[PDB]
């Protein structure tokens, strides 16, 4: 076809990351492009993980023997930190402490679930300048959401960041409100 | 321990669930609608109007 094809470009492009924040998360995954947080444990014991499943990329997926300004990297940046155990009060301000003076405009982190078994904590931790919303958010945000499986009551993060529109690094150069001249 | 189940919904299963429920057999992707929008934007399917 061609319709049933360019979908298969993406719907193959999709299940991969189902297979990536499952197997390379503890090994520090950020996003296919392979963007990453930590990058040795992705190779392996000089070869243990590099090819442990490229050899399974084929003998599952029809092949042959031979062929911090991102939220999805920061919403798991320290999702470990929780299921390892710290205060959910100051640890959350640390990450928005972190990215904000990394020349970044705005950040926001929420944690939802049972802090103590009730109608369930939902407290929210913001810092900065977060445009939202219109079209300028698709350009300027990253947001990820990862279910956190601790032993008594699932919880869940919703991190958001935003790109400094000044030091944009691609696309528009500032907020579409922009006004300036010289005296 | 098996009998004819060639066609129909018992035949087709969700890729992420094997959920026979909510099938969308359009464009040869074969996922359910509960299931798809979670994994929507990463296929280049976006929202404009």
């Amino acid at each position: 076809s061609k319709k049933r094809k360019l979908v298969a470009d993406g719907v193959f492009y999709a299940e991969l990351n189902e297979f990536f924040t499952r197997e390379l998360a503890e090994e520090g995954y950020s996003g296919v492009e392979i963007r990453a947080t930590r990058t040795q444990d992705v190779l392996g014991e000089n070869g243990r993980r590099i090819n442990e499943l490229t050899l399974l990329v084929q003998k599952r997926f029809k092949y042959a023997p031979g062929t911090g300004l991102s939220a999805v990297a920061q919403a798991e940046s320290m999702k470990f930190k929780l299921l390892n155990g710290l205060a959910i009060r100051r640890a959350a301000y640390g990450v928005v402490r972190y990215v904000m003076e990394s020349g970044a405009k705005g950040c926001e982190v929420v944690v939802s679930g049972k802090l103590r078994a009730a109608r369930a904590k939902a407290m929210k931790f913001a810092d900065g300048f977060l445009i939202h919303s219109g079209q300028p958010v698709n350009d300027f945000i990253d947001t990820a959401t990862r279910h956190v499986l601790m032993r008594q009551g699932v919880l869940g993060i919703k991190v958001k960041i935003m790109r400094d529109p000044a030091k944009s690094r691609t696309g528009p150069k500032a907020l579409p409100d922009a006004v300036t001249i010289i005296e | 321990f098996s009998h004819p189940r060639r066609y129909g919904k018992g035949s087709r299963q969700c890729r992420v669930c094997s959920s026979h429920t909510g099938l969308i057999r359009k464009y040869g992707l074969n996922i359910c609608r509960q299931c798809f929008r979670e994994k929507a934007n990463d296929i280049g399917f976006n929202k404009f109007r």
């Binding site: 319709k3 | 609608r33 929507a40 399917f45 976006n46």
Partner: peptide, 30 residues
């Protein structure tokens, strides 16, 4: 060439409660 939008109209909710709100995603080829 003429472009053909690929449209998938699915209802916005996992269950069957709320107002009957739909939403169309597009794939825009070229």
């Amino acid at each position: 060439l003429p472009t053909k939008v690929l449209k998938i109209s699915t209802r916005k909710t996992p269950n069957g409660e709320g107002s009957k709100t739909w939403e169309t995603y597009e794939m825009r080829i070229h």
